Design a protein around this ligand. Structure first.
Ligand SMILES: *CCC(=O)N1CCCC[C@@H](n2c(NC(=O)c3cccc(C(F)(F)F)c3)nc3cccc(C)c32)C1
Length: 287
């Protein structure tokens, strides 16, 4: 039972500029630590229960350090508390594949699968069940480099959920029926994640409401084989969706498998046509 010696950095409101709203509330901004001669591009995410939730997220986000996990730079305390994170200029991967589907190649797809598996296997190393793994919750720093994010529902070690709203279609069968959550439950969601990428952002079980999903998978139904997918790739998705959680693959095995395929991508995915001076990115700002 190791002591968590992560540092929580409290940043002065004066140290950062908010340029613009990226979505709804996240802002693009610049962080200039006092007299340190750097500008860090940042994303700022700006009720008592609401602060309880947001600080629990900062707790988790500050205890992780991995190149495919979203990095917390600090918090600012305000009327409204702010999380300050590394800016991901290309947004979330779901929107990204949806917008650039006609120019995404097999090697980017397979390398995103490797990188996400690395993030997840790192979160498993630190005994953390994500519980909301999905393409909308993977962000894009560059087309070559993605990071897992948005774990307000992440918990730390099975686990028993209480009352939260849930994704259901990204969820393992045991989670839906028994509110049980494990690293292997995450692997299920990883499989749905890979499926949304391989379909370029299709909605899982589109036009079905969550009420029926439980019996659908009880019956033995799963998500379809995406057109670009050889059986090799699709079989790995199907393994993430076994009813026996221990029969599903381990994130370290998923890394290996997708790495193998990333060395020869066109064998595994068939796609038509595959063929402001002192700025520092946060991945280079350490102290
Ligand atoms: C799937 C929707 C999407 O693209 N999002 C969701 C949140 C709105 C901001 C969007 N966005 C960012 N986000 C970030 O840079 C970011 C970094 C760290 C954490 C978070 C978090 F947890 F709050 F979501 C977000 N960056 C850009 C750049 C361009 C366009 C957009 C829409 C964008 C991401």
């Amino acid at each position: 039972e190791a002591p968590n010696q992560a540092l929580l950095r409290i940043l002065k409101e004066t140290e950062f500029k908010k340029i613009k709203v990226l979505g709804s509330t996240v802002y693009k901004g610049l962080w200039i630590p006092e007299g340190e001669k750097v500008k860090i591009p940042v994303a700022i995410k700006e009720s008592p229960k609401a602060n309880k939730e947001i600080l629990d997220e900062a707790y988790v986000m500050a205890s992780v350090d991995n190149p495919h996990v979203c990095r917390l730079l600090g918090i600012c305390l305000t009327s409204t508390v702010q999380l300050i994170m590394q800016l991901m200029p290309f947004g979330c991967l779901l929107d990204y594949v949806r917008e650039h589907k006609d120019n995404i190649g097999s090697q980017y797809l397979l390398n995103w699968c490797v990188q996400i598996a690395k993030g997840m296997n790192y979160l498993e190393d630190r005994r953390l069940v994500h519980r909301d793994l999905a393409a909308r919750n993977v962000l894009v720093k560059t087309p070559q480099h993605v990071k897992i994010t948005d774990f307000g529902l992440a918990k730390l070690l099975e686990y028993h959920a209480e009352g939260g709203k849930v994704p259901i279609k990204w969820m393992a069968l045991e989670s839906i029926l028994h509110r049980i959550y494990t690293h292997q439950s995450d692997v299920w969601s990883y499989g749905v994640t890979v499926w949304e990428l391989m379909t370029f952002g299709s909605k899982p079980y589109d036009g079905i409401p969550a009420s029926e999903i439980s019996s659908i998978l009880e019956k033995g139904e799963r998500l379809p084989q995406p057109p670009i997918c050889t059986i090799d790739v699709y079989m790995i998705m199907v393994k993430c969706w076994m009813i026996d959680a221990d029969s599903r693959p381990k994130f370290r095995e998923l890394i290996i498998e997708f790495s193998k395929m990333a060395r020869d991508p066109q064998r595994y995915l068939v796609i038509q046509g595959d063929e402001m001076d002192d700025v520092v990115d946060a991945d280079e700002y350490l102290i």
